[PDB]
Amino acid sequence: GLSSEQQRAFLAVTQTPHPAHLITGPAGTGKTTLLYALQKFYKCRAVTLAPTGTAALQARGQTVHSFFRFPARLLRYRHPEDIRPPGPHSPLRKAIEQMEVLILDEVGMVRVDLLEAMDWALRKTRKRLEEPFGGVKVLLLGDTRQLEPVVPGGEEALYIARTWGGPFFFQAHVWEEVALRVHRLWESQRQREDPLFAELLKRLRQGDPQALETLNRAAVRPDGGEEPGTLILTPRRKEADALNLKRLEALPGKPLEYQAQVKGEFAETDFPTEAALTLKKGAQVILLRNDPLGEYFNGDLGWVEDLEAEALAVRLKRNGRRVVIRPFVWEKIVYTYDSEREECKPQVVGTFRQVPVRLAWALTVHKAQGLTLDKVHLELGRGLFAHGQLYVALTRVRRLQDLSLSRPIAPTELLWRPEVEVFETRIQEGIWQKSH
Numbered sequence: 087g088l089s090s091e092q093q094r095a096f097l098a099v100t101q102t103p104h105p106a107h108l109i110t111g112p113a114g115t116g117k118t119t120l121l122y123a124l125q126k127f128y129k130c131r132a133v134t135l136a137p138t139g140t141a142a143l144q145a146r147g148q149t150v151h152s153f154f155r156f157p158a159r160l161l162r163y164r165h166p167e168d169i170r171p172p173g174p175h176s177p178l179r180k181a182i183e184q185m186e187v188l189i190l191d192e193v194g195m196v197r198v199d200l201l202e203a204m205d206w207a208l209r210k211t212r213k214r215l216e217e218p219f220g221g222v223k224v225l226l227l228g229d230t231r232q233l234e235p236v237v238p239g240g241e242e243a244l245y246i247a248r249t250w251g252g253p254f255f256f257q258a259h260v261w262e263e264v265a266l267r268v269h270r271l272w273e274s275q276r277q278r279e280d281p282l283f284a285e286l287l288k289r290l291r292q293g294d295p296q297a298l299e300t301l302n303r304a305a306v307r308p309d310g311g312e313e314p315g316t317l318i319l320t321p322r323r324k325e326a327d328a329l330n331l332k333r334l335e336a337l338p339g340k341p342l343e344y345q346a347q348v349k350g351e352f353a354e355t356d357f358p359t360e361a362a363l364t365l366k367k368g369a370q371v372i373l374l375r376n377d378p379l380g381e382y383f384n385g386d387l388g389w390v391e392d393l394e395a396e397a398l399a400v401r402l403k404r405n406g407r408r409v410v411i412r413p414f415v416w417e418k419i420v421y422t423y424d425s426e427r428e429e430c431k432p433q434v435v436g437t438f439r440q441v442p443v444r445l446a447w448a449l450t451v452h453k454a455q456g457l458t459l460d461k462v463h464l465e466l467g468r469g470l471f472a473h474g475q476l477y478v479a480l481t482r483v484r485r486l487q488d489l490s491l492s493r494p495i496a497p498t499e500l501l502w503r504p505e506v507e508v509f510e511t512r513i514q515e516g517i518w519q520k521s522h
Contacts, residue, residue, distance in 0.1 A: 092120040095269045100127070105219060106264050108193070108226040110513070111271035112481075113456025115376065115384065121145065121227065125189055130429035132187030132225070133421045135204075137195045139356040145191035148420050148432070150200060154207050160242045161203035163249050163259075169203050171211045181423030181430045183212045187223040194233035196255045199246060205260045218264040226255075226266070230510060232455055232478055234503075252505045261520045268513045278458075280485040287480060290500040292507065301486070302494045310490035311463040315403065317387070319479060320465040323450040329465075330445040337366040342393040344413075344441050352418050352436035359444040365390055371400060372446035373411065381409040385457040387446055398441060403460075414442040451479045459483055466493035474502050 088096060099107040111117055125134050125146065134147030142149045151158060154169075155178075161168045172179035188208075190196065205219055212220035235253045237243045250257040256266075289297035311318040320326040334341075346361035358374055365371070373386040382388075388400030391407060401407035418436025423429070448465075455478075462483050470476050476499040483489050502510075512518055 087119070088123050089116065091271060091273060092116060092123065095120060095271065096123060096127070098269055099225060099267075100124075102267075104265070104267055105217075105221060105223045106226070106261075106266045107224070108230075108266050108268040108513075108518075109271070110228075110230050110268060112229045112274070113232075114274070114458070116274055117227075117271075117456070118144075121189065121191065124225065128187050130184065130424075130427070130431055132189050132223075133185055133430060133432075134189045134191065136191045137197070137200060138192070139353050140358075141192040141195070143356050143358070143416060143418065146419055147189070147191065150190075150196070150204065153421060154204065156200075156203055156207075160245060161199040162245070163199070163202055164206045169207050169210070171207060177423055179211055181421065182208065184429065185222055187225060188219070189225045190227060192228040192232070193226045193255050194228045194230055195235055197235040197237075197253050198250045198255060198257045201255050201258045202250075202260065205258070218260050229456070230506075230513075231481065233506065234473070234475065252503075254505060254509070256509050256518065256520070257505070259520075261518070265517045265519045267517050270513065275458075275484070278484040283484065283486050286486065287477070290480065291474070291477060291502045293497060293501045295497060298495065298497050298500070301480075302491075304486060305489050305491050306494055307463075307490045308492050309463075310492070313461070313490075316461045316463050316490070317446065317454075317459055318448040318463045318465060319451055319454055319482060320448055321451055321467060321470050321475065321479065323452070325465060325467070326448040326450050327445075329448040333447045334364065334366060334369055334445065337368045339367040339393075341366050342395075344398075346438060346440035349437035349439065350418070350435055352416075352438050356418070356436075357438065358416060359440060359442070361440065363440065363444075365393055365398065367391060367393055369445065370447045371443045372449070373400075373443055375414045375442035377409065382411065388443070398443070400443070411441055411443060413440050415439050451482065454482055457482065459488070461488045462490070464489065464491040466491065466495070468493075471496055471498040473498075474500055476500055477502065 095109055134145055135150045135153055136142035136145050136147055137150055139149055157168060208220040208222055209215040214220035237246060237253045246253055286297055318329055341364045344363040344365060367390050369390045371388050371390055373382055373384060376384050387403045391399040391401055397410050397412055399410045416438035417434045419432045420435050421430045421432040424431035459482055464479055
């Protein structure tokens with residue numbers, strides 16, 4: 087069930103001896119089903135890995151650090167003190183010396199030292215320490231805009247500045263050895279781009295001053311979140327929960343707590359939704375899972391109508407109330423070699439059981455990633471000039487008319503980092519390889 091756009095990438099990456107392939111493009115269905123077709127297409131030829139627990143959950147894979155027993159600190163270059171190879175006959179080594187393909191979702195947040203750990207770990211155990219990754223066909227994924235890995239400062243920042251120069255996944259010295267065939271999609275909705283707004287976003291990423299004045303003198307509207315169907319996006323999830331709470335304690339209806347059943351090993355930070363979910367009839371809520379039948383979708387903004395102990399009815403914004411949702415089961419997955427099969431065969435270690443819905447009067451930009459939204463309102467916190475971290479917020483809409491920021495933006499909150507502005511544009515032909 088693959089469309090021509092998803093099939094073109096599938097066939098372009100699977101039918102070639104080239105190991106390194108990057109697939110760019112925004113989040114959403116079409117991108118997920120592309121991975122769900124890839125990982126099932128090989129199905130112990132490869133494993134699916136991710137930098138963060140959240141990414142590993144929504145990608146059916148294992149955390150990189152947890153798959154490789156990598157320690158939660160700066161991974162020094164080819165250092166055996168940090169990158170310890172699994173010993174002989176160990177029940178990780180036998181499974182890693184099968185992985186012809188390695189899928190890697192959300193490469194935006196993969197730090198450089200983390201990528202160079204994977205390469206050396208794959209080389210010093212599959213015996214292919216000359217070829218990059220031990221020959222393993224790496225399939226990188228994720229919009230390269232929802233990037234910028236945190237670097238603490240002090241000792242760790244200086245070492246990374248000296249070894250690589252920056253924290254990005256492309257500054258790794260692996261790419262000085264192999265070429266990265268980049269299949270960039272950016273082609274899911276032609277005119278719900280508003281090509282003037284796309285060029286406006288590109289001029290903001292390049293520091294243009296008058297593009298910034300244009301953005302401010304068309305979209306600045308204090309508290310323009312009172313207009314109907316306005317989702318008040320916030321950068322930080324602290325004020326988002328605070329905004330949902332104050333709008334939740336306005337509803338007269340009696341609340342109902344939905345209790346999650348966290349079975350097995352499931353980290354607290356990996357929780358998709360709050361386990362003590364207080365809901366009232368009339369709350370703006372959003373779905374977090376696609377319906378196996380096909381009635382509702384992931385990211386479907388609804389309104390609570392009825393509150394049953396193990397089900398709830400929501401009037402969808404998209405078409406009109408049709409579906410009652412039933413608690414979904416999230417599984418923590420770890421890839422450990424199967425004895426009988428002689429082939430990795432991943433394993434369910436954790437379980438999270440609650441209704442796939444969360445409060446949606448406000449949302450963190452992180453959780454809002456890739457959602458097609460009709461109308462948004464941005465909440466400035468006077469400190470978000472985190473070297474362009476607010477660009478990801480402007481991209482959450484297709485036309486300038488839908489966005490309404492509460493306070494003006496400084497030129498610095500949107501300006502991209504110089505190393506990024508060189509990567510996004512040297513990949514616009516195709517293959518990318520690091521010179522000198």
